């Protein structure tokens, strides 16, 4: 009855999405034909027979990987009016996914989920899934967060963005896109989580000992996030949490609403025996900094709000115990003005284990959920990159031929600059 | 005769009535299904304060359940014990408060109000001679503290003469579940203190040491913590249910522990409480429950009763005892922390005694106090409140839906005015 | 004595009397081939108002069937009940009204009205002394508009003593079936008011209203729609058939309703309605049923009772009960809503009460209301009407049937001295 | 009891007529053979043995189209006496199909017709069959509508009349045909329903995915929408409609009698799953200008009345609910002095699927009938058209030499001007 649909825009939201509506059928012994042999009412709309669908827009501008979920195992699962295909790709490049290719399938999109909205009555939100670095996933996801803010508007939107890698960064044009997506999303977005590629593949060599990751693994963690985000909505809890409640306890400034996920325990099989994975072990496993997502180091900034979320076989008084201890160390250090730092949240089912796998069955997990002031050194790292390649003019050209005013890179640069000084307004104490 | 309506609010509220329900049921025989396998024919003496006969000799509880969505009424009504509650009663919303204050009491609350207030006038219209009200909720959630408060601010002007009291319960000093719960908190106490008669604080924190400390349960979940509040509940009204030596109920303790109008804010205790195993290693005599509903571990609120002074104590005893063994420890108490009461209240200890103990116990007793060691729970709030409206943090979730900055200033205003009187009759003498 | 003829018009008035009639046949043990099977006694005592005894003790419905095509003909015949009319009473045509007032009134309602009045002239004489008719029909149809207010004209001009009354069915104010319905009620209210005693007004959607949020079906059908109409019917003349401590009949009602000849419209209510798991968390008594007839949820027309006042209330009661339960609840209604009736009558409440309960229930209650809220029934016909006359469209299906445009004038002119009257006494004192 | 015969004329109406009587054989199990191993009485005269016929007259002027039905599967099923032929056809021309060639069978057709008439007694009306653009269904039609009007005046007849497309025409001519048969027909006509091939193709290929459509998949989809509105004399239904009910609700004005059709769902095999197809889901499909059959903007004109047939297991409470929120939207707006739109019928049985067809079997279904001035844009084309070639007097003689008045033009073409304008008077609003 609170249902909630997802978008997944671009290659990389199709290919988290794969590993996604994968662990959602395991989670609920649901067929990959639809059948099963209504606490699962929120993700999937029934049909008159014995046939569940999933409440997800496949969207993006190359017909690749779109294609490969029409002909793969997951076949039969999918509306196919939902598979939204596009000519050609925006090809690394804000201004063809905003403006040239952008504006001519937007109205077909928006015909699609406002028909999902009409047969949900308790729409809670969106969850947008996308990259910052790629053309689709930071153009035509600025053009989408432009019309539902206009449409809905008091709807949670939440996205669970890839932000791009310090060091290993593919696209050159990356410095490019991210600063023109943030630019658009800022007046649209509610709550937008960060998640690094480069990050994961140390969590993967460290812990789980492979040495040679893929990026189907990679979509394994990230959707373990987000299966325990959503775990409210489809389980019962002893203290559940809603997607409304996100945006209201970890955004305390209007501007500044990019907190990061972390998630615990990530271990491999055999490294499942010989120790016992207490809720107080595994807690101060969140907030090493050696498991952040993001390569930031936490100890340059300080915690505003934490969201903790639990799930398992969880005691609610062993909880209060673990929090209070790292509430008690000198390296963790919160803001002056922000005395309350944590919202808990416990849900009972333990995280299954997809078959062909690589991680090991437990009975507890943590995702956390922080909102701290250690990204601003990134971002800042993010404008020196900016304005080295935009002083001397380069790739301008590709980006003022396909329908943009040259002087808008100053509109969002300053911008961007001006949300640099906010982190320093943040940063600084109280008085007396 | 003397019939009492429960309304339930928020998350937290209903998951106490859940076990509240249950609690009352064993001290009536209620079987699930809702009829009466009891034995003792004393439980059908006093039945129609909460519950309604109905046709069939089944019998209903006179519940009310609010919520802002069906999530957790769904939980209820398919648990146990979710089968004896009228379906009609059941009432929720689509939206969801979003854990809020602002939402909870201005924007979807007025527009669930009128369909509350017209099923809590039909159990209004049923009732004989109605006693008063109750309520269970929070403070530092979004729907208890909107939808509760507001819910107490259209029965007051209804019924003024009926009691008004509320089973809230109380953030935590050392960890927090809600980060904006000096905003909720602060926005509904300058609620409770104008349209209540008493007000029970209890602290989650407080009751994970007894589970702990006491009860050595290793593993205490909500279930467990929750029956205690619920045997606090039971213990209030059992004057009212069963005869006794000398009989009490909500409108005797409404005027012997509330000396001015503004201090109605309690703390609750109960005992006896012990181990599993260990119990048969001590007496069950009435000096054994004197002495554990005084110390400090036993309060249900997060407050040392060592710092302040007490104004008004009222203990409700259970079960067949002797009113002299009463005497010697309610004196003695009284003697030997002389300093710890306050002196211009002479004998300021009210005795309450039926005759029914609880369903396999030999007797029982339950605290209810009054102290100025309250005024560390207003003042850990209040500067909590003010480090962070000052930089107006968390404020474009309040003041996008209708509240200007004046009214944060009127219930900081107000709670610093409470602080300042427990503050005076601690030093005064 | 005291017989009742029954006149079924229109598609959904036979579609209400296919119901009706197994109704009646359940309150009187009448098995679908038409012999008796009953087991009290008291069930064969009044069969003649409404039964005809055959030769072979099988007994046959005083019924009449009017329609200008075979279609829902063929299919009252061919259900449940079909084989229990007599095969002479169905009376058809082979046109059809084509959905219009003028086809149903002017050229078809003149050549089939002589075949009807044999028929009803010869259920007259061999009834013993003839209480009155009754008429089940629409307003928005063309059939039962047309020739269902022809019969009244022909009716009245033979038999002025005898009382007549139609459970019409009135169109609804969100949706809509006709769309020439503002044409068709309007040239039906016009002889609705200068030849019927009383008049029963039903609006489909205050039906919807009672299946969806009293009853909780999730698929109701019209045949479950039509089951509440017919219950209502068969509460009117409930305390024709059978005796009671304070006995009523369709003459009485037609006499303690009607203030002012003119002023003759309704609105019927029925209690009680429960949910079907969900009665067993009610007892049903008096004020269980005093409750339910009052609210504006119960209303069988699409008016809220809150804006108008009543002018006069019947409640006729079924079952055995106590007569000061009743007048506790009677009287009460009438002080705490004092405001909401007339001034100028005293003890507009007319009791009515009746030993016999329906099968299978304990007790049972029929509501028959006169207000002045039904006076915003007619301001939203008298708008879109006006709204559509001015333009004159849809007026060539009229005009080409021998209808000149002074024939709407006057019933316009008629409707709004109707709203004026309702308007006056609204507002009286 | 009710029986209606149905007329159809030309190749356009042969053709569409082979998929409906197609189509009422396996509504009532009646073999090819006119055997079956009375609700069917309205559509089918039993002989004196166990055969049932059609009541229809198939007539046309050439000998092409009527011998493959006297040659087809459908052989042993029609009266021999009904296939009535011609020697040449009209050759795309009014002059042909009124003076010249219509004057020497008009006789024989309604000898036949009216021997029809006598054996029925609850005869409703005609359903005639044609197309605007051909020379037999604009011309012959013309005639035949004179003469029903003479000889029988009080029958409801209607026609399933083909409009020519605006973009897509094979006669050169169907300017001046279109024009010429209005003139003749406005004054005889009740109700004539208006059905275009080129949004048909849009439907199929959009909705059905078939990019290859020929005339026999065009000819399922129209006698699906000749079922339904012939479904409540055929069975009994929970709230049903007459032939006479249709011209009483959707003509406003005596010149305006041109409604529109619009059947939904129409969707494929596949994709009949992973959807539920409810009756609030299905009726926002009709109001949606995608799916509407002829090649007009709704939103550039106001809806005066509109009927709505539903088949099939239909709730009479959600009916109401999905009316309801359809007057609440903001583009689909009705006419100032109509507060009252909607005609409504309910039928019990569900439409059957051919075998061989197309469509997938369903468990409901609607058919539209809407009358807008949406269609007063389309007209005013259509004099654009025949103003520029009669300026020049293009093809004039072809029709001057077939025994017709050259002044007759300016009869027509100031007629349907003097009707343009009549839209202009109902499109202006009431007063105060
Ligand atoms: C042989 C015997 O007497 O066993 C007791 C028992 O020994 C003890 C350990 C009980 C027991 O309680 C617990 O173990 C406990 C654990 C976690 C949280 C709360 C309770 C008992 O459950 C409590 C329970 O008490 C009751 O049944 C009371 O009537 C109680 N009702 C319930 O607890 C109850 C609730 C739901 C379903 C069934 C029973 C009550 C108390 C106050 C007001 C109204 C009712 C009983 C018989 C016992 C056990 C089983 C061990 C104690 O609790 C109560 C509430 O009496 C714990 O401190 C006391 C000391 C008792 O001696
Ligand atoms: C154990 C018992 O009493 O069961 C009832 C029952 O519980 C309820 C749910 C019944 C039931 O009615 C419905 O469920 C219903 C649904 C849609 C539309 C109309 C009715 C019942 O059908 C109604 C039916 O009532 C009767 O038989 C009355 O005599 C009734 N006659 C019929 O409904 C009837 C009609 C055709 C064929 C057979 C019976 C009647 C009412 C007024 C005046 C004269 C007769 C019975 C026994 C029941 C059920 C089966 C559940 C209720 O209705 C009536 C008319 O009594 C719904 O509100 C009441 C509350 C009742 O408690
Ligand atoms: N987390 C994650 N990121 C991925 C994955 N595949 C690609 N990416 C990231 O996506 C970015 C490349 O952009 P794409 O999303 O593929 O491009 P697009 O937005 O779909 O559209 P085009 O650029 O026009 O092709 C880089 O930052 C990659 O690291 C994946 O499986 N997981
Ligand atoms: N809907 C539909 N239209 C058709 C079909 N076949 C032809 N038409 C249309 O009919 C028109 C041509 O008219 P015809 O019926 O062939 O001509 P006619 O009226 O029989 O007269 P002649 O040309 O003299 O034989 C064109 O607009 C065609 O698009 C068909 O199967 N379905
Ligand atoms: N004792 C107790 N406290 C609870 C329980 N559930 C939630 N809480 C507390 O209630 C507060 C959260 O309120 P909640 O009811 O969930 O929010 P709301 O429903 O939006 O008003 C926190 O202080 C929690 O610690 C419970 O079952 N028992
Ligand atoms: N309650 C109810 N209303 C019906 C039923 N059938 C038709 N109606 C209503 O009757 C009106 C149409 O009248 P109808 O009898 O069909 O036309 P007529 O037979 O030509 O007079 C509309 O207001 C319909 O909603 C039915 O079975 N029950
Ligand atoms: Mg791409
Ligand atoms: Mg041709």
């Given at each position: 009855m609170r249902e909630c649909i997802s978008i997944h825009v671009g290659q990389a939201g199709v290919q988290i999405g794969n590993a996604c509506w994968e662990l959602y059928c395991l989670e609920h012994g649901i067929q990959p034909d639809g059948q099963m042999p209504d606490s699962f009412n929120t993700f999937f709309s029934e049909t008159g027979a014995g046939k569940h669908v999933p409440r997800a827009v496949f969207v993006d501008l190359e017909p690749?990987?779109?294609?490969?979920?029409?002909?793969?195992?997951?076949?039969?699962?999918?509306?196919?009016?939902?598979?939204?295909?596009?000519?050609?790709?925006?090809?690394?490049?804000?201004?063809?996914?905003?403006?040239?290719?952008?504006?001519?399938?937007?109205?077909?999109?928006?015909?699609?989920?406002?028909?999902?909205?009409?047969?949900?009555?308790?729409?809670?939100?969106?969850?947008?899934?996308?990259?910052?670095?790629?053309?689709?996933?930071?153009?035509?996801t600025s053009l989408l967060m432009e019309r539902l803010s206009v449409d809905y508007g008091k709807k949670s939107k939440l996205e669970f963005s890839i932000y791009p890698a310090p060091q290993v960064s593919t696209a050159v044009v990356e410095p490019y896109n991210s600063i023109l997506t943030t630019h658009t999303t800022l007046e649209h977005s509610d709550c937008a989580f960060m998640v690094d590629n480069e990050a994961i593949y140390d969590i993967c060599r460290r812990n789980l000992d492979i040495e040679r990751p893929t990026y189907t693994n990679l979509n394994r963690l990230i959707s373990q996030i987000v299966s325990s985000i959503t775990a409210s909505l489809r389980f019962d809890g002893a203290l559940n949490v809603d997607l409304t409640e996100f945006q209201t306890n970890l955004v305390p400034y209007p501007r500044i609403h990019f907190?990061?996920?972390?998630?615990?325990?990530?271990?491999?099989?055999?490294?499942?025996?010989?120790?016992?994975?207490?809720?107080?072990?595994?807690?101060?496993?969140?907030?090493?900094?050696?498991?952040q997502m993001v390569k930031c180091d936490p100890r340059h900034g300080k915690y505003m709000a934490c969201c903790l979320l639990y799930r398992g076989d969880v005691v609610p008084k062993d909880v209060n115990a673990a929090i209070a201890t790292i509430k008690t160390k000198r390296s963790i250090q919160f803001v002056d003005w922000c005395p309350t730092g944590f919202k808990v949240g416990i849900n009972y089912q333990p995280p299954t284990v997809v078959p062909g796998g690589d991680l090991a069955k437990v009975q507890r997990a943590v995702c956390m959920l922080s909102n701290t002031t250690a990204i601003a050194e990134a971002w800042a790292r993010l404008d020196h990159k900016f304005d080295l390649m935009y002083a001397k003019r380069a790739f301008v050209h590709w980006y003022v031929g396909e329908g943009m005013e040259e002087g808008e890179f100053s509109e969002a640069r300053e911008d961007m600059a001006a949300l640099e000084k906010d982190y320093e307004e943040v940063g600084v104490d109280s008085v007396e | 005769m003397r019939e009492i309506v429960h309304i339930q609010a928020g998350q937290c509220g209903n998951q106490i009535g859940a076990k509240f329900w249950e609690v009352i049921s064993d001290e009536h025989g209620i079987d699930p299904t809702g009829?009466?396998?009891?034995?003792?024919?004393?439980?059908?003496?006093?039945?129609?304060?909460?519950?309604?006969?109905?046709?069939?000799?089944?019998?209903?509880?006179?519940?009310?359940?609010?919520?802002?969505?069906?999530?957790?009424?769904?939980?209820?009504?398919?648990?146990?014990?979710?089968?004896?509650?009228?379906?009609?009663?059941?009432?929720?919303?689509?939206?969801?408060?979003?854990?809020?204050?602002?939402?909870?009491?201005?924007?979807?609350?007025?527009?669930?109000?009128?369909?509350?207030?017209?099923?809590?006038?039909?159990?209004?219209?049923?009732?004989?001679?109605?006693?008063?009200?109750?309520?269970?909720?929070?403070?530092?959630?979004?729907?208890?503290?909107?939808?509760?408060?507001?819910?107490?601010?259209?029965?007051?002007?209804?019924?003024?003469?009926?009691?008004?009291?509320?089973?809230?319960?109380?953030?935590?000093?050392?960890?927090?579940?809600?980060?904006?719960?000096?905003?909720?908190?602060?926005?509904?106490?300058?609620?409770?203190?104008?349209?209540?008669?008493?007000?029970?604080?209890?602290?989650?924190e407080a009751l994970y040491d007894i589970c702990f400390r006491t009860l050595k349960l290793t593993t205490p979940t909500y279930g467990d913590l929750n029956h205690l509040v619920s045997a606090t509940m039971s213990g209030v009204t059992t004057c009212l249910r069963f005869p006794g030596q000398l009989n009490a109920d909500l409108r005797k303790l409404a005027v012997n522990m509330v000396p001015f109008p503004r201090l109605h804010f309690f703390m609750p205790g109960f005992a006896p409480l012990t181990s599993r195993g260990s119990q048969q290693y001590r007496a069950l005599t009435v000096p054994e429950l004197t002495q554990q509903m005084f110390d400090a571990k036993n309060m249900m609120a997060a407050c040392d009763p060592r710092h302040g002074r007490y104004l008004t104590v009222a203990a409700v005893f259970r079960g067949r005892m002797s009113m002299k063994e009463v005497d010697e420890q309610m004196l003695n108490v009284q003697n030997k922390n002389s300093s710890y009461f306050v002196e211009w209240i002479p004998n300021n200890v009210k005795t309450a005694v039926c005759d029914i103990?609880?369903?396999?116990?030999?007797?029982?007793?339950?605290?209810?106090?009054?102290?100025?060691?309250?005024?560390?729970?207003?003042?850990?709030?209040?500067?909590?409140?003010?480090?962070?409206?000052?930089?107006?943090?968390?404020?474009?979730?309040?003041?996008?839906?209708?509240?200007?900055?004046?009214?944060?200033?009127?219930?900081?205003?107000?709670?610093?005015?409470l602080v300042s009187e427990y503050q005076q009759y601690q030093d005064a003498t």
């Amino acid at each position: 009855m609170r249902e909630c649909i997802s978008i997944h825009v671009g290659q990389a939201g199709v290919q988290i999405g794969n590993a996604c509506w994968e662990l959602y059928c395991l989670e609920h012994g649901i067929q990959p034909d639809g059948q099963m042999p209504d606490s699962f009412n929120t993700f999937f709309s029934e049909t008159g027979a014995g046939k569940h669908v999933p409440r997800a827009v496949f969207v993006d501008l190359e017909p690749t990987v779109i294609d490969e979920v029409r002909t793969g195992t997951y076949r039969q699962l999918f509306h196919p009016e939902q598979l939204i295909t596009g000519k050609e790709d925006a090809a690394n490049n804000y201004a063809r996914g905003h403006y040239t290719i952008g504006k001519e399938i937007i109205d077909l999109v928006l015909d699609r989920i406002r028909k999902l909205a009409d047969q949900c009555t308790g729409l809670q939100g969106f969850l947008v899934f996308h990259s910052f670095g790629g053309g689709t996933g930071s153009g035509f996801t600025s053009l989408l967060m432009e019309r539902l803010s206009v449409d809905y508007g008091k709807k949670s939107k939440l996205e669970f963005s890839i932000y791009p890698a310090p060091q290993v960064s593919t696209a050159v044009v990356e410095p490019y896109n991210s600063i023109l997506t943030t630019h658009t999303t800022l007046e649209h977005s509610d709550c937008a989580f960060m998640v690094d590629n480069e990050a994961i593949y140390d969590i993967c060599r460290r812990n789980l000992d492979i040495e040679r990751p893929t990026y189907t693994n990679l979509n394994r963690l990230i959707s373990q996030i987000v299966s325990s985000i959503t775990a409210s909505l489809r389980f019962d809890g002893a203290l559940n949490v809603d997607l409304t409640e996100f945006q209201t306890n970890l955004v305390p400034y209007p501007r500044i609403h990019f907190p990061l996920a972390t998630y615990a325990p990530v271990i491999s099989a055999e490294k499942a025996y010989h120790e016992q994975l207490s809720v107080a072990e595994i807690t101060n496993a969140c907030f090493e900094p050696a498991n952040q997502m993001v390569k930031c180091d936490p100890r340059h900034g300080k915690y505003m709000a934490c969201c903790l979320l639990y799930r398992g076989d969880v005691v609610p008084k062993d909880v209060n115990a673990a929090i209070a201890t790292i509430k008690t160390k000198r390296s963790i250090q919160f803001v002056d003005w922000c005395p309350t730092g944590f919202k808990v949240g416990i849900n009972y089912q333990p995280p299954t284990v997809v078959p062909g796998g690589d991680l090991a069955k437990v009975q507890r997990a943590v995702c956390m959920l922080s909102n701290t002031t250690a990204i601003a050194e990134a971002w800042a790292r993010l404008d020196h990159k900016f304005d080295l390649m935009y002083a001397k003019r380069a790739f301008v050209h590709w980006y003022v031929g396909e329908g943009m005013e040259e002087g808008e890179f100053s509109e969002a640069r300053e911008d961007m600059a001006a949300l640099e000084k906010d982190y320093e307004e943040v940063g600084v104490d109280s008085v007396e | 005769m003397r019939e009492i309506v429960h309304i339930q609010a928020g998350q937290c509220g209903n998951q106490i009535g859940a076990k509240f329900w249950e609690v009352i049921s064993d001290e009536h025989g209620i079987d699930p299904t809702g009829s009466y396998h009891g034995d003792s024919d004393l439980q059908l003496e006093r039945i129609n304060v909460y519950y309604n006969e109905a046709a069939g000799n089944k019998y209903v509880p006179r519940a009310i359940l609010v919520d802002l969505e069906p999530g957790t009424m769904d939980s209820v009504r398919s648990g146990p014990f979710g089968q004896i509650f009228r379906p009609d009663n059941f009432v929720f919303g689509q939206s969801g408060a979003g854990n809020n204050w602002a939402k909870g009491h201005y924007t979807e609350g007025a527009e669930l109000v009128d369909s509350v207030l017209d099923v809590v006038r039909k159990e209004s219209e049923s009732c004989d001679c109605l006693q008063g009200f109750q309520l269970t909720h929070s403070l530092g959630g979004g729907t208890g503290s909107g939808m509760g408060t507001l819910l107490i601010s259209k029965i007051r002007e209804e019924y003024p003469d009926r009691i008004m009291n509320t089973f809230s319960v109380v953030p935590s000093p050392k960890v927090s579940d809600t980060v904006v719960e000096p905003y909720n908190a602060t926005l509904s106490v300058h609620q409770l203190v104008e349209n209540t008669d008493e007000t029970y604080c209890i602290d989650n924190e407080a009751l994970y040491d007894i589970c702990f400390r006491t009860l050595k349960l290793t593993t205490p979940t909500y279930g467990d913590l929750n029956h205690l509040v619920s045997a606090t509940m039971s213990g209030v009204t059992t004057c009212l249910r069963f005869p006794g030596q000398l009989n009490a109920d909500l409108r005797k303790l409404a005027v012997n522990m509330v000396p001015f109008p503004r201090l109605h804010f309690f703390m609750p205790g109960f005992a006896p409480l012990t181990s599993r195993g260990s119990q048969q290693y001590r007496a069950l005599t009435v000096p054994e429950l004197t002495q554990q509903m005084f110390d400090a571990k036993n309060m249900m609120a997060a407050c040392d009763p060592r710092h302040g002074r007490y104004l008004t104590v009222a203990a409700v005893f259970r079960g067949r005892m002797s009113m002299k063994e009463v005497d010697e420890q309610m004196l003695n108490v009284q003697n030997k922390n002389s300093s710890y009461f306050v002196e211009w209240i002479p004998n300021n200890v009210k005795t309450a005694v039926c005759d029914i103990p609880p369903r396999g116990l030999k007797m029982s007793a339950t605290f209810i106090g009054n102290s100025t060691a309250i005024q560390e729970l207003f003042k850990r709030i209040s500067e909590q409140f003010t480090a962070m409206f000052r930089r107006k943090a968390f404020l474009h979730w309040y003041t996008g839906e209708g509240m200007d900055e004046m009214e944060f200033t009127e219930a900081e205003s107000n709670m610093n005015d409470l602080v300042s009187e427990y503050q005076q009759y601690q030093d005064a003498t």
